[PDB]
Structures are given as structure tokens and as C-alpha cells.
Design a protein around this ligand. Structure first.
Ligand code: 1VV
Ligand code: NA
Lengths: 292, 291
């Protein structure tokens, strides 16, 4: 009983300045929707869907006349096509990673000016409150976050001095972090998601170049393995999964800003370009309408 | 009375950091296309000392990468050539500068996350930078004016909030003192001196771009609004030529302005006198000195 009419949202991003675009792609018919724009333009933000509502978390408003790190949590309702402000986070978080467990949004890492966060906080939609949980073992900005077996995985990033290939796993019931096996490649701003019980890490920045390589983590073998690489090299990419296929949206390749949207098929182990965004951008917040 | 003075505009930003050097003559209304900067940059500040234009600080903002500048480059109008001078101790994007007794003061600015309260002074004869007493507040996007041999730092951004505050530097004592705060919060506003009053035109208050203009009389210690500009503009270049303020370019929230307005203090009115060859923001502006 698969759900029909699910939409891959893309919120915010950067192209010469921070963007406020909210657009929705339908993978079935291949159409794009031009939805209500963000109140404040934002890049380096993260997107997630909880209970039929899209959330935009953290980021930064990069403009020609100054920069401002965001602690904002804004909620988009598809029925009304309207953004509504929620309770803001305890601290601003640019280049943030987020994950959802038991209907609560986890805000992981990110930066506030010079402060590279290892702190993590949890949002409860029912009472509109943020609360700090156990902090990470490593400071991480540009961190990719994945949820698997009711555990939160923080993958890659940048601690302020070193660019990270390491990763750690959070345990909500115990409230503690534990380091897992490090990746084969150093990655900051990589697209991290979960597909068929494996944590993927696509693209990112290794300190030298933007990456097109993709590797997945099998939790039982505790081993990172390379799969088919993407066509285009990209960091700060939006990522998500829809009906057994990973979708990577936009990004930055060291020179241009990508409008390309590649689609990974795990059965054949091949990437294919399915569509293009209305304009090239990086640092977007991406999510999908939930299954059921 | 010197004639043939030129309003220079160096650097700027449109899509990426620019390396334009153009000069406007207010007398005949002509534009000159002079030698380009060796490295493109925006958020810089321009000043003239002894017949030589200087380009201080800034930021090479491009799609390939972003790099804050600690560079001092000197333009000679006789040779139409840029020459590199001794660099500053630290990079300073969105810098403010003022000249006192032939020395260039580099005030505030940013180096990535770091918002400077530090100030350093350049000696053209020795080609040396030296740190003086730091400001009481960290300021980026600060406007600098020089009146009665005192340097005034007006407005800006301290890393958390945009500022309406201002402070005055005393070169002989080497210390800063807070003056009366502005009526409006301003970052990236055009600050200059005219008829013994420190003007503060436009800017960015965090929410919107401003068209309002207010001036500070040093004796009354009071900020007072004057006639506002036609266009709302932040990150604008500003200068004074024969008793009239000239604001060049800027950013209005949507477009990058090519407009150049001119303020007449006798009538308290602005008027569009010319257009730049292309719209831009974060330009370094200065004028040929008067006798
Ligand atoms: O995040 C920021 O501070 C600002 C800095 C100014 C540009 C926007 C943004 C930024 O740099 N991002 C996007 C968000 C994001 C999110 C996660 C990881 C990395 C990033 C990097 C990716 N990236 C670059 O490194 C870069 C360098 C130069 C131009 C454009 C870019 C670019 O798009
Ligand atoms: Na903006």
C-alpha cells in the first residue's frame, strides 16, 4: 500500500546570496511546484517533515550588506501554503544537520560565527520547546545526519581545524554518543541519508576538491563500502529518499552552482539525471512527504 | 581653489567582486576608465594622501572562493598604475578609513568570523603599519569621518547586533570615547564631513536598507535628520566635493544601484547628477584633495 503524490521539497539555498525559494518536485509525473517563499532567506539550513508539516532549521542569511546566523525554526503547512515561525533554538546553527526520531526534531552541530558546535538539542512540536540533549564527542559543521533503527548518526563535517572522516551514533534512550567506524573519505557538507538499512554518504568536500564518490555504512558489518559515484562532483547538496531511490539536489562543485538532480537506483547501482532545478544553488534544505 | 578634481570609485561588487577603477569629474560630468585593480575586491575603503589614491582592505568574493584582504595598494594618476604597499597586520573586510596628518587609519572590519575592534595606522613615507589604541566596540561595515583632527567611527556591526552607536578617537592622547548614539541603527552607511558636521547616509539596520540621512553637530552633541535620498541604499560609497555630498552606488535589497545622487546643504535636497557605467556596491571612494 504505497502512498501517492509525495513531494521532494527544496527550501532556501545559496546562489550569489542566500535564497528564500521553496519548490517541490514530484518524482512520479516529473513536475515542479512554486510554493510560498521563506520569510528570511537562508543557506546552510536543513529540512525535515514531521506529521504532514515541513520544517526549516538553522542556516545563515548571506547578503551583500552583511551576514546573520539563524537560530530560527519555521514550519510550512502544505494545506495553507504558509510559513509559520516556531520556537527558536538555544543557539544559531549554520551548516546544520537534522534527523527525526519519534516525532521529535534533532538539531545537530552547525556553527555560530566562530563557535563550531558539538551541542545537540531536541524539538517537541506538541509543546513548541527546544531542549538540550547529550553533546557530541566531536564538534561538527557541515554534518550529515541519518536516522536508522531509532538511532541518530552524525557523519563527517568540520571541527574548526580538521575536516572529518569520522562518525558517531546517538542513543536516545541512554542519552549518549559512541564513535563508529570512520569513513574511507574525509567529507564535509556531504549528503547523508538512509536506504535499505544502510547509511549513505554522497559527495562533500575533502579539503582539496568537491567529491562525486559515494559510500554506504552497513551497521552489522561495521564497514564503509564505495558504490557507484555520482555524475557531477558536489558539496553542500540536498539529499533524500523516495520509494527505494536516493535523490541528490543541487550543490557546489568549486566553481559552478548545480541545478542538476541525480537519482540513484540501488538495484542496478547506477546514477541517472532525472530533472533540473529552476536555477542552480547550494546549501539547500531537502525533505519528502512521509510514507505512512 | 583647485579645479579638475576627480571622484574615484575603486572595486565593488556585482555578482562577484570587481576590479574597476573609474573617475568622475563633477565639473563637466565625464567618466574616466582608469587602470584596473590587480586583485578584485569589495567592502574596501578608498582615500587620497599626497596625490596618491589608496585601496585598503576588502574581500575577493567570487564563485571560486572567498578571501579577505589585508592589502594596501597605491594608485598613481600620473602613471595610471597600481603599486602594492606594506599589508595590514590582519585582513579587514567592510573596513572604514580616515586620513589625519598624512597617515591612513584602518578601522575595524572583519576576517572571517572575527569582527575587529583593533585599529592600525599607515605611514606612507616609511611604508609601515602600526597598531594604535583599539576601539571600545567591535565594528564592521563602519563609516569613518575626520573632523577637527579627530577620527569618528560611526555605526557598524559587532557580530551580534547592528549598531547605532559612535565613538571618537583622539590621536594625541591615543584613546577612544563614546559620543551620542545615532537616531537610527546603521551598518554600511555613507559617512563623511560637510560644513563641520558628520553625516551618516543610508545603511542596513538588520531589517531593511535605509534612505534616511542624519548629521552630527559636534558642539550641540545632537544627531538631526536631513532630507532623505531618492534611493534606499546600503554598502554605498560616499565623498565630498566643493560643499556637496556625493553618494555612489550601493544595494537597495533587490538591485545594485548605478545611481549617483548629490546633496546640496543650502537647499536640503538630493538630485541624481550621473550614472555609473554599471551598478555596484561596496565600493571604495575618495576625491582629489583641496588646497
Ligand atoms: O555556509 C556558509 O558559511 C556560506 C559561505 C558563503 C557561501 C554560502 C555558504 C557556504 O559556503 N556553503 C553553503 C552552505 C554549506 C552547507 C554545508 C557545507 C558547506 C556549505 C558551504 C558550501 N559552499 C562553499 O564552501 C562555498 C565557497 C565559495 C562560494 C560558495 C560556496 C558554497 O556554497
Ligand atoms: Na536579502
Amino acid at each position: 500500500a504505497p502512498k501517492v503524490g509525495r513531494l521532494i521539497y527544496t527550501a532556501g539555498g545559496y546562489f550569489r546570496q542566500s535564497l528564500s525559494y521553496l519548490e517541490a518536485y514530484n518524482p512520479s509525473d516529473g513536475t515542479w511546484l512554486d510554493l510560498a517563499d521563506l520569510q528570511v532567506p537562508r543557506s546552510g539550513l536543513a529540512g525535515c517533515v514531521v506529521g504532514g508539516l515541513l520544517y526549516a532549521v538553522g542556516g545563515r542569511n548571506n547578503s551583500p550588506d552583511g551576514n546573520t546566523d539563524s537560530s530560527a525554526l519555521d514550519c510550512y503547512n502544505p494545506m495553507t501554503n504558509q510559513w509559520s515561525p516556531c520556537a527558536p533554538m538555544s543557539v544559531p546553527r549554520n551548516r546544520i544537520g537534522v534527523g527525526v526520531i519519534d516525532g521529535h526534531i534533532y538539531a545537530v552541530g552547525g556553527s555560530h560565527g566562530c563557535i563550531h558546535h558539538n551541542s545537540v538539542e531536541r524539538y517537541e512540536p506538541e509543546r513548541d520547546e527546544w531542549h538540550l540533549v547529550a553533546p557530541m564527542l566531536t564538534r561538527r559543521i557541515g554534518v550529515g545526519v541519518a536516522v536508522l533503527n531509532r538511532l541518530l548518526y552524525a557523519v563527517g563535517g568540520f571541527d574548526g581545524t580538521n575536516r572529518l572522516n569520522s562518525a558517531e551514533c546517538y542513543y536516545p534512550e541512554r542519552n549518549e554518543w559512541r564513535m563508529i567506524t570512520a569513513m574511507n573519505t574525509i567529507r564535509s557538507g556531504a549528503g547523508v541519508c538512509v536506504l535499505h538499512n544502510c547509511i549513505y554518504a554522497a559527495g562533500g568536500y575533502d579539503g582539496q576538491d568537491q567529491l562525486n564518490s559515494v559510500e554506504r555504512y552497513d551497521v552489522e558489518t561495521e564497514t564503509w563500502t564505495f558504490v557507484a559515484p555520482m555524475k557531477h562532483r558536489r558539496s553542500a547538496l540536498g539529499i533524500t529518499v523516495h520509494q527505494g531511490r536516493i535523490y541528490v539536489l543541487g550543490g557546489y562543485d568549486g566553481h559552478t552552482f548545480l541545478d542538476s538532480v541525480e537519482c540513484y537506483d540501488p538495484d542496478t547501482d547506477t546514477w541517472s539525471e532525472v530533472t533540473r532545478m529552476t536555477s542552480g544553488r547550494s546549501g539547500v534544505g531537502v525533505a519528502v512527504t512521509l510514507e505512512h
